[PDB]
């Protein structure tokens, strides 16, 4: 039920670095964030399809998917314990049919006209002015980005 | 919903080694097992803890890393350890499982098989067999209240688990 928000950028634009700065800023504001990331590349090998491993510091659930990739984002969010969370950030999926902020950096090897802005995009965080039908954000102002995220949250109540 | 079954033994008796061979044997009969385990190691070091380390270090309290062949959820518990067995089992996707095996916890209050190996230096008289025990798997004959299984007969053990499972449904 809690809000899901994707972040999208071309490689080399500095998305991971930005996320790493954005999370503590959200935390500082009382937000408890989750994150879902898509990547490429003995008793599990013995054949337990699902394994929980619990320690003092933390616990893990590991789910083997040998025949078909798990790509249903709403299903994955539902695995998290949302009683402990206010927001789930998302990155790296193809058919992201949720709200999305796009990152742009002018010297990062792409012209502004190459940007693809679909109907789910709510904002573009950029280091130069752009001609757009959505909110335009300063990508080098993380505090201000945290502001925009919180306000978007306080509007998603339902 | 689905049956939970613990395996219990003193350290060094042969619990993890036994489970290493039983799980394949169950899978061969078409049983799809889950596993819940306790560990004393630092989960940040492997695979897949390492994959989510930077994001959790920055403040992400729960992470999922999803790829072609598998996905992993991590839940940070910096205040108190998670030891609620029924909660843990409920976070599994039980629509795709038949049986959940449980191992390594100090307190495990469910159906249980207890293990004994003579050469481990303990006397059989020191075995604690409470009301939850359905069998003792042993390498020496014991005359017991509950079933007595050969700890070295893995297929026999897999048969006994199926038969117990039939009584649950």
Curated annotation (Swiss-Prot), chain B:
InterPro entries from the UniProt entry: MGD_biosynthesis_adapter, MobB_dom, P-loop_NTPase
Binding-site residues for GTP, renumbered to this chain: 12-16, 46-49, 95-98
Molecular-function annotations in GO: GTP binding; protein homodimerization activity
Pfam families in UniProt: MobB
Keywords of this entry: GTP-binding, Molybdenum cofactor biosynthesis, Nucleotide-binding
GO process annotations (BP): Mo-molybdopterin cofactor biosynthetic process
Domain of life: Bacteria
Induction: Is expressed at very low levels under both aerobic and anaerobic growth conditions.
Signal peptide from the UniProt entry: none
The UniProt record lists the keyword Phosphoprotein: no
PANTHER family cross-referenced by the UniProt entry: MOLYBDOPTERIN-GUANINE DINUCLEOTIDE BIOSYNTHESIS ADAPTER PROTEIN, MOLYBDOPTERIN-GUANINE DINUCLEOTIDE BIOSYNTHESIS ADAPTER PROTEIN-RELATED
Oligomeric and partner information: Homodimer. Interacts with MobA, MogA and MoeA in vivo.
The protein's role, per its UniProt record: GTP-binding protein that is not required for the biosynthesis of Mo-molybdopterin guanine dinucleotide (Mo-MGD) cofactor, and not necessary for the formation of active molybdoenzymes using this form of molybdenum cofactor. May act as an adapter protein to achieve the efficient biosynthesis and utilization of MGD. Displays a weak intrinsic GTPase activity. Is also able to bind the nucleotides ATP, TTP and GDP, but with lower affinity than GTP.
Family classification: Belongs to the MobB family.
Name of this chain's protein: Molybdopterin-guanine dinucleotide biosynthesis adapter protein
Organism: Escherichia coli (strain K12)
Lineage of the species this protein comes from: Bacteria, Pseudomonadati, Pseudomonadota, Gammaproteobacteria, Enterobacterales
């Amino acid at each position: 039920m809690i809000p899901l928000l994707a972040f999208a950028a071309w490689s080399g634009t500095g998305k991971t670095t930005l996320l790493k700065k954005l999370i503590p800023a959200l935390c500082a504001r009382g937000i408890r964030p989750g994150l879902i990331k898509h990547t490429h590349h003995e008793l599990r090998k013995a054949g337990a399809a699902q394994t929980i491993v619990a320690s003092q510091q933390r616990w893990a659930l590991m789910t083997e998917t040998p025949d078909e990739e798990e790509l249903d984002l709403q299903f994955l969010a539902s695995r998290m314990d949302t009683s402990k969370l206010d927001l789930i950030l998302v990155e790296g999926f193809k058919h992201e049919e949720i709200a999305k902020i796009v990152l742009f950096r002018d010297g990062a090897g792409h012209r502004p006209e190459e940007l693809v802005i679909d109907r789910h995009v709510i904002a573009v965080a950029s280091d130069v002015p752009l001609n757009l039908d959505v909110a335009l954000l300063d990508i080098n102002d993380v505090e201000g980005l945290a502001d925009f995220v919180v306000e978007w949250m306080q509007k998603q109540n339902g």
